[PDB]
Ligand binder design. Structure first.
Ligand SMILES: *[C@@H]1O[C@H](CO)[C@@H](O)[C@H](O)[C@H]1NC(C)=O
Lengths: 213, 212, 159, 106
């Protein structure tokens, strides 16, 4: 079985996510054809389905936004939603659900999913705050977009100890991360620790230094 | 309304259970529960359907059942090809549509059982001046890679302001995850202390911060 | 033998395309001479309908219909809507009524639903009339008898 | 579930109460309903509360129903009230013959 999803992958809020998905053999009227999304963090959300006849079975949560249609002659079907928001960022799978009901009791042979990111602009660049402290101290690269960012220490003259963490996508749509360095405890106050943050997509650089309290 | 545990461990070959806790509107009605296996990057394959039936090419290892308002999946004979996310899925009537679970992260062993290793940073002065506050909870060197954080202000949990990162493979082949909390400056000042508690399989590891 | 004739039932305001993975015809299908009447959307109201058929022929007619026993009181509202579902059959000598028995069962071919069938012989130049509120497996084709035959049960080959 | 090799005999009862008031006294208000289901059987039982003459001083009734449950087959009861539940299924032992007489054994 073939199940191919394609469509607009990179849009911003208030636009209209249009996808479509085509098949091999196993043609329509045997099964219910469904759209099931999955936010990249966690979860699995059913959003709708439709048969060869064009009869729909929508999620009422997303209804008045979802419109699902079927090109039966070309053996494919399309998804049209919505007045889109940012929380619709998800991997979108089309899937063959087996017709029981009235319904779609289970789904066999999902598609492969196409990522759709509905974030908001724009290349911004971070603000960097120090992290006060054996012991360990670091930097805080906050509110930057898009990824990635270099985190040097002493401009590159300290490698052991660094644990530059994966960034998080905030509800603000901007990324944030923090680095950290473990160092001997009573050795502090006697030596400096610059952290050189670099964000090339907005051309910003910082050499913010860190001291204990 | 389908609750699954976050994580379950298990040595190769041993048997492990994954619970699909449901309400009376989904499994309590006559509706059947199915299961789906999602290997990394891959899309979910159909697993147990009809609460006990498995489609072609699914081993006997996987065995499904259903009792009252809950369902359960059982894996015996763990292999590397079994490490994946698993989802239960049924139908709900009060919501008029099908429903999936939260997913369960199956981690097959083959490594030690290290735990965090949490280090917590309080808001810096420089950002308190900009009328902001953000506490930073760092987690490294833990196996397996599935934790559950919870923030408190010296007694009470904080539901909002939390951003929690997905774990990922360290260079030391272990896992690493961070979680940030957003606060207003006086909220930070007008409290005894704060604590980022992190639960790994059977251990709570907590840090603490107080304004100074 | 048996020669079929369409009874000519039209529907409006409901769905007629119920199907199941147990009547598998290159996908999920249903009985050939029957139509599984459903409600437009899940949990929507099934409107009460009345459909007649007049046996215009000279041999007696064989009318066959079904009742859908859902797995729970909830699934019945999913398919046909809330409310008590009721089928009423009647001819010049037949007078019955049918109600589904929604409730828990074991699994049979992996399903816990049931569909049970009833039949009556409509006299020539008679009229059968259905009234129904839902849970009704409607017929599409009345059957007629061709003549005379024998019927046996065996486990040996023909010759 | 009939775990055994031979068919099982399943019996239950329905308590038809003296009035709607006693039915709500024993199980509560709201309609009652007892569904019994198996692979070959499924039926619904509603109690029939109402007034009727006394028998053994009592106006209530408990009528019993039954079905045969095949091997490896499950019988499922769902009940709201008015349901006399069974504690013990029965399996037939062997062969016998039953008679009706009015004289002594010898
Ligand atoms: C049957 O016969 C009666 C009277 O002989 C007539 O009124 C009725 O219309 C007939 N039915 C049909 C289907 O012709």
């Amino acid at each position: 079985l073939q199940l191919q999803e394609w469509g607009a992958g990179l849009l911003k809020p208030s636009e209209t996510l249009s996808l479509t998905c085509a098949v091999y053999g196993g043609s329509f009227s045997g099964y219910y054809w469904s759209w099931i999304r999955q936010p990249p963090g966690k979860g699995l959300e059913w959003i709708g389905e439709i048969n060869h006849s064009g009869g729909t079975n929508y999620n009422p949560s997303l209804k008045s936004r979802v419109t699902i249609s079927v090109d039966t002659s070309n053996n494919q079907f399309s998804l049209k939603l919505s007045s889109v928001t940012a929380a619709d960022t998800a991997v979108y799978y089309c899937a063959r659900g087996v017709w029981e009901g009235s319904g779609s009791d289970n789904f066999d042979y999902w598609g492969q999913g196409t990522l759709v990111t509905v974030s908001s602009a724009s290349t911004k660049g971070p603000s960097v705050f120090p992290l006060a402290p054996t012991a360990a101290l670091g930097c805080l690269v906050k509110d930057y977009f898009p990824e990635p960012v270099t985190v040097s220490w002493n401009s590159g003259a300290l490698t052991s100890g660094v644990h530059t963490f994966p960034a998080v996508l905030q509800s603000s749509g901007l990324y944030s991360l923090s680095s950290v360095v473990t160092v001997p405890s009573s050795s502090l106050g006697t030596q400096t620790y610059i952290c050189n943050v670099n964000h090339k997509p907005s051309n910003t650089k910082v050499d913010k230094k860190v001291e204990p309290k | 309304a389908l609750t699954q545990p976050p994580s379950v461990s298990g040595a190769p070959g041993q048997r492990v259970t994954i619970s699909c806790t449901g309400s009376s509107s989904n499994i309590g009605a006559g509706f059947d529960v199915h299961w789906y296996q999602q290997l990394p990057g891959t899309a979910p394959k159909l697993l147990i359907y009809g609460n006990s039936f498995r489609p072609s090419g699914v081993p006997d290892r996987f065995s499904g059942s259903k009792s009252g308002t809950s369902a359960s999946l059982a894996i015996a004979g763990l292999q590397a090809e079994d490490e994946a996310d698993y989802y239960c899925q049924s139908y709900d009537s009060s919501l008029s549509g099908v429903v999936f679970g939260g997913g369960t992260k199956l981690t097959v062993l083959g490594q030690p059982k290290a735990a965090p290793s949490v280090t917590l940073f309080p808001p810096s002065s420089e950002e308190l001046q900009a009328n902001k506050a953000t506490l930073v909870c760092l987690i490294s060197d833990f196996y397996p890679g599935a934790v559950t954080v919870a923030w408190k202000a010296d007694s009470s949990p904080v539901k909002a302001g939390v951003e929690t990162t997905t774990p990922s493979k360290q260079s030391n082949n272990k896992y690493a995850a961070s979680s940030y909390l957003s606060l207003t400056p006086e909220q930070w000042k007008s409290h005894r202390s704060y604590s980022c508690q992190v639960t790994h399989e059977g251990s709570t590891v907590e840090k603490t911060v107080a304004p100074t | 033998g048996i020669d079929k004739e369409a009874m000519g039932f039209t529907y409006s305001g409901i769905r007629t395309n119920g199907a199941t993975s147990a009547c598998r015809r290159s996908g999920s299908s249903f009985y050939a001479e029957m139509k599984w009447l459903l409600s437009n959307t899940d949990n929507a109201a099934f409107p009460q309908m009345t459909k007649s058929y007049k046996n215009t022929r000279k041999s007696p007619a064989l009318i066959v219909w079904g009742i859908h026993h859902s797995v729970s009181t909830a699934e019945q509202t999913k398919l046909y809507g809330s409310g008590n579902k009721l089928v009423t059959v009647g001819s010049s000598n037949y007078q019955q009524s049918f109600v589904p028995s929604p409730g828990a069962r074991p699994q049979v071919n992996g399903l816990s639903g049931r569909i049970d069938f009833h039949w009556l012989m409509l006299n020539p130049n008679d009229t059968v009339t259905f009234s129904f509120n839902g849970a009704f497996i409607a017929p599409d084709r009345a059957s007629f008898l061709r003549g005379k035959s024998m019927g046996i049960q065996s486990g040996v080959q023909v010759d």
